Design a protein around this ligand. Structure first.
Ligand code: PC1
Ligand code: 3PE
Ligand code: 3PE
Ligand code: UQ1
Lengths: 96, 142, 92, 67, 314, 80, 45
């Protein structure tokens, strides 16, 4: 019975993973836009805040290469409301 | 600079439906629109950046959007019953709801003509040909 | 957090009780076997720690290597036990 | 006879079902009439938070085809 | 709300914890041809509250001893035992932890210290001798206790206690794996220092020797809560109560019934058996049970693979 | 040798069973009609998104709808 | 009532009830009168 039950359970599992797989294209998309937007929002504010700073390039890749590099959590939510940052940082370890 | 795209460039209609809604229609979505879903994805993997493939991303939600409009036009309440029961469960498990699933699945085959994809046949790798060709310097390395 | 909330209530409930308790009523180490047991215990503990990942490793694509590895670990420790049972070990 | 050990047990049992019924209704009342979703893997959280970001400020609120 | 859900899940257990001593002093009684305590209150219902008040009022004599490894020890014992009820998955749990059984195994392991700390703190010979032996069988039994769980998990797929409700939707894990249930039950009897395996603090008065009044009570409370918790873990891991997603309480109703019966069983075991010798006890675990457990552990890594039954993660 | 096993089954009736299991677990995997499935059933379970390849041409890869008859199948998993 | 004296008496009583309901004895068991106590512990009494 255990052999048959887990084989069934496995069939249900493959289905659910297949399900996310299908929806992954979308989420990838929404995130991409959200993420890019997030940066722009904080970056836009950066222009306002670090405005009078001398020799202050509004922003510049800490690196030399010019290729897109995924933004670290801090960068995205750093200048944002504290909580927002906390949520992301300690928001999974702490269950729903 | 950072050449971060502008908001107007990244503003497009949103699906915004409860994740549960999606999981219930997930299988069919994976069926309907899979070609544009994969093209956005194929552009997404090669060119590491999201700067390049956002045009494709707007298309992906655009398909999804009419996918939903068609189900609202026909077989909306069979779907409505299926999602509500699916949402109640904590892990939104598919097997707790099979009676609702059957009526939702049978209708849309009857009216939309779509089909629930058999176990598998969504995981299998797809071939989608896209105009833009892979860039020889993806990492843009010296 | 959710857990923290519960735990601090848990300590509070116990500290409350001990306090009430106090406030309301106003060398031979012969058994190196003991030590021996205890040495074994960690060798077994450590072994458990190696076996603890087996639930995730079951799903490993290899499978053959998984079992080949796991069976070797269990067998070699058990032999360790066996030798504990050959000399005057585990016989306190 | 042995009839009497039951009183005590009754008060044990009643005190071991409360917890299971309690935890399982303070969830269905602090999660909008629906079991509290279980975020075990990153994806379950995403959809959980995506949903939050979807409408209102709470996940149980579930926007449907009519949105 | 969450706070209310902390009262429930605690008080209710504490009140039930009190009613276990009563159902122990009556079930042992009738088995021995005696009514047991019925004169205080109606049918002895007020009896548990009565000695609690007597215990707290009597002087907590601090021996002419440490004063912390003495007060930390009962606080730790009650704290860990009541804490381990946090993740238990009655219907749905209070704090669902993805690695739940490792939490229960780790929290249990920490209680061995309280015994070690209390024994060192007392500074009298009876206490130290008792603690050293007590610590020895507790951790000795932990080694088979842990391996027995690892066999279970591998057939459950995960460490989360919540998964077993979905694993045991068709059959109890006793049918399969009964050989370990027995070995889980005997190990549950050792880890709660109950009778067959209760050499410490025997008629030989170990770590209560110097403990009276409030400290006595806290461990005391701890032991009995544990007595329940471990029995409850048997009633989730091996005896899987029927679960219906539509009505969650029949799960808790049957959890109530099975837990009480297996809690009744260790009460029944105590009156029925003489206590084992210190070495007799370790002879069982290292000679009789550990070879059985390690081998049956391998059988539970093999049963999945060649029966193509590898359990679904998640 | 029979005695080595008849008294060891009467007295010491734990190590006998213990070893027996050790072995039976060391054999069943080798000989079984399902052992192979484990590495497949777990292999199949799709956890990470399956990235699609460019269609240079002349390929048997399922193009378009994954439902295309081409590609891998788990009917072995079904009706298993 | 609230005049403390009454309140005190009631409280004392509770305290007395707890000690008087649960008395835990210890039997040095010198000599034989111990056998007559084991009888108390036993089922008739
Ligand atoms: C939160 C606080 C955590 C503090 C951790 C300290 C770790 C370093 C050791 C400190 C204790 C030793 C010391 O230097 O002080 C001696 C003192 C000795 O105290 P004592 O009075 O118990 O020891 C002597 C007893 N007489 C003298 C009566 C025989 O240590 C303490 O006062 C208690 C220390 C408690 C440490 C915190 C325990 C928190 C829970 C742990 C589980
Ligand atoms: C007295 C000491 C012993 C107390 C009892 C034993 C406590 C054991 C705690 C084990 C660690 C907690 C844990 O395992 O899970 C916490 C959980 C994170 O796990 P998980 O939910 O799987 O996260 C991802 C998916 N949600 O979610 C969290 O991470 C919550 C945050 C961590 C909480 C850990 C426990 C906090 C205890 C606070 C009091 C500690 C008192 C220590 C006293 C000794 C001196 C230091
Ligand atoms: C996991 C693997 C299994 C567990 C391994 C870990 C524990 C190993 C213990 C080995 C102990 C060997 C030993 O010396 O025990 C002798 C046994 C008990 O004797 P003693 O300890 O003196 O106690 C006497 C008082 N009761 O007295 C005996 O004579 C017991 C004899 C037991 C063996 C009898 C035959 C049993 C069946 C064997 C089947 C094949 C065994 C495996 C073969 C592997 C290679 C194919
Ligand atoms: C006759 O010798 C005695 C004992 O051993 C036989 C006891 O255990 C005890 C202890 C028994 C009770 C009633 C607690 C007593 C009284 C005693 O004197």
């Amino acid at each position: 019975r255990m052999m048959r039950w887990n084989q069934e359970r496995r069939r249900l599992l493959i289905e659910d993973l297949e399900a996310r797989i299908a929806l992954m294209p979308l989420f990838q998309a929404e995130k991409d836009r959200r993420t890019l937007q997030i940066l722009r929002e904080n970056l836009e504010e950066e222009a306002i805040i670090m405005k009078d700073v001398p020799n202050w390039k509004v922003g510049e890749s800490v690196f030399h290469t010019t290729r897109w590099v995924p933004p670290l959590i801090g960068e995205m939510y750093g200048l944002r409301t504290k909580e927002e940052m906390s949520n992301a940082n300690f928001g999974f370890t702490w269950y729903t | 600079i950072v050449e971060l795209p502008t908001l107007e460039e990244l503003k497009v209609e949103e699906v915004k439906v409860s994740s549960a809604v999606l999981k219930a229609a997930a299988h069919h979505y994976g069926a309907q629109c899979d070609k544009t879903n994969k093209e956005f994805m194929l552009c997404r993997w090669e060119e590491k950046d999201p700067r390049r493939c956002l045009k494709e991303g707007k298309l992906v939600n655009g398909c999804a959007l009419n996918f939903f409009r068609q189900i609202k036009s026909h077989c909306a309440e069979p779907f409505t019953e299926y999602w509500t029961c699916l949402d109640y469960s904590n892990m939104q498990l598919f097997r707790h709801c099979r009676q609702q699933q059957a009526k939702f699945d049978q209708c849309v085959l009857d009216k939309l003509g779509w089909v629930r994809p058999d176990l598998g046949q969504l995981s299998k790798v797809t071939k989608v040909k896209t105009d833009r060709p892979l860039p020889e310097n993806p990492y843009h390395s010296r | 957090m959710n857990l923290y909330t519960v735990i601090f209530i848990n300590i509070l409930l116990s500290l409350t009780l001990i306090l009430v308790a106090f406030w309301l009523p106003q060398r031979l180490p012969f058994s190196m076997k003991f030590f021996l047991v205890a040495i074994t215990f960690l060798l077994f503990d450590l072994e458990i720690a190696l076996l603890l990942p087996l639930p995730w490793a079951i799903q490993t694509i290899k499978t053959s290597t998984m079992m080949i590895m796991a069976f070797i670990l269990v067998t070699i420790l058990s032999l360790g036990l066996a030798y504990e049972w050959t000399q005057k070990g585990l016989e306190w | 006879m042995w009839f009497e050990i039951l009183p005590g047990l009754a008060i044990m049992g009643v005190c071991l079902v409360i917890p299971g019924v309690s935890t399982a209704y303070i969830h269905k009342f602090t999660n909008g009439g629906k079991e509290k979703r279980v975020a075990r893997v990153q994806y379950q959280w995403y959809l959980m938070e995506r949903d939050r970001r979807i409408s209102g400020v709470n996940r149980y609120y579930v926007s449907k085809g009519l949105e | 709300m969450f706070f209310i859900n902390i009262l429930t899940l605690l008080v209710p257990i504490l009140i039930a914890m009190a009613f276990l001593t009563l159902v122990e002093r009556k079930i042992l009684g009738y088995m021995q041809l005696r009514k047991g305590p019925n004169i205080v209150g109606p049918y002895g219902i007020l009896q548990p509250f009565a000695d609690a008040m007597k215990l707290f009022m009597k002087e907590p004599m601090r021996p002419l001893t440490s004063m912390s490894l003495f007060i930390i020890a009962p606080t730790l014992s009650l704290t860990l035992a009541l804490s381990l009820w946090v993740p238990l998955p009655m219907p749905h749990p209070l704090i669902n932890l993805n690695l739940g059984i490792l939490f229960i195994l780790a929290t249990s392991s920490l209680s061995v210290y309280s015994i070690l700390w209390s024994g060192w703190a007392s500074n009298s010979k009876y206490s130290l001798f008792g603690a050293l032996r007590a610590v020895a069988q507790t951790i000795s039994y932990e080694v088979t206790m842990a391996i027995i769980l690892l066999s279970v998990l591998l057939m459950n797929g995960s460490y989360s206690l919540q998964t077993l409700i979905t694993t045991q939707e068709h059959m109890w894990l006793l049918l399969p794996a009964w050989p370990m249930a027995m070995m889980w039950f005997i190990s549950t009897l050792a880890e709660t220092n109950r009778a067959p395996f209760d050499l410490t603090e025997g008629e030989s008065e170990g770590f209560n020797v110097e403990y009276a009044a409030g400290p006595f009570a806290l461990f005391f409370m701890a032991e009995y809560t544990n007595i329940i918790l471990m029995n409850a873990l048997t009633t989730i891991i091996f005896l899987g109560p029927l679960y219906y997603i539509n009505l969650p309480e029949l799960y808790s109703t049957n959890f109530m019934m099975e837990a009480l019966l297996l809690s009744s069983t260790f009460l029944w075991i105590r009156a029925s058996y003489p206590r084992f010798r210190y070495d007799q006890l370790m002879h069982l675990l290292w000679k009789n049970f550990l070879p059985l457990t390690l081998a049956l552990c391998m059988w539970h890594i093999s049963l999945p693979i060649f029966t193509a039954g590898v359990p679904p993660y998640m | 040798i029979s005695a080595f096993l008849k008294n060891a089954w009467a007295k010491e009736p734990v190590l006998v069973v213990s070893f027996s299991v050790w072995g039976l677990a060391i054999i069943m995997p080798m000989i079984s009609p399902y052992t192979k499935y484990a590495s497949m059933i777990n292999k199949a379970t799709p956890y990470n998104y399956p990235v699609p390849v460019r269609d240079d041409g002349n390929m048997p890869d399922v193009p378009s709808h994954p439902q295309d008859p081409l590609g891998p199948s788990l009917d072995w998993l079904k009706n298993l | 009532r609230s005049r403390a004296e009454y309140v005190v008496t009631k409280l004392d009583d509770l305290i007395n009830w707890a000690r008087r309901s649960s008395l835990w004895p210890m039997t040095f068991g010198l000599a034989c009168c111990a056998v007559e106590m084991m009888h108390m512990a036993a089922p008739r009494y």
